[PDB]
Design a protein around this nucleic acid. Sequence first.
DNA 1: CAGTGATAGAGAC
DNA 2: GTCTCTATCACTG
Length: 66
Amino acid sequence: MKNGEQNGPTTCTNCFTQTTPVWRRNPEGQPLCNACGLFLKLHGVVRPLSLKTDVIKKRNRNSANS
DNA sequence: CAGTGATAGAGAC
DNA sequence: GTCTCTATCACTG
Ligand SMILES: [Zn+2]
């Protein structure tokens, strides 16, 4: 079990990010963090990966329910 | 239960 | 005062 950590540490092949709320994918099958998957897919052009950070800003949450 | 697409908000200068 | 990037939500099988 354990998986080599995550056998092939889910590491953004685009920005090395290891921490992320969810993992995205690309029609090529390469693993990507949510930011690159969201930004890369929406922009379609290379991006200064220098924007990435090891800290993620926590936003609020629409407390659904009743 | 998990993942995707779409929209909106906040921060900095 | 304005722009941008990123995260979360809702929905479905
Ligand atoms: Zn990434």
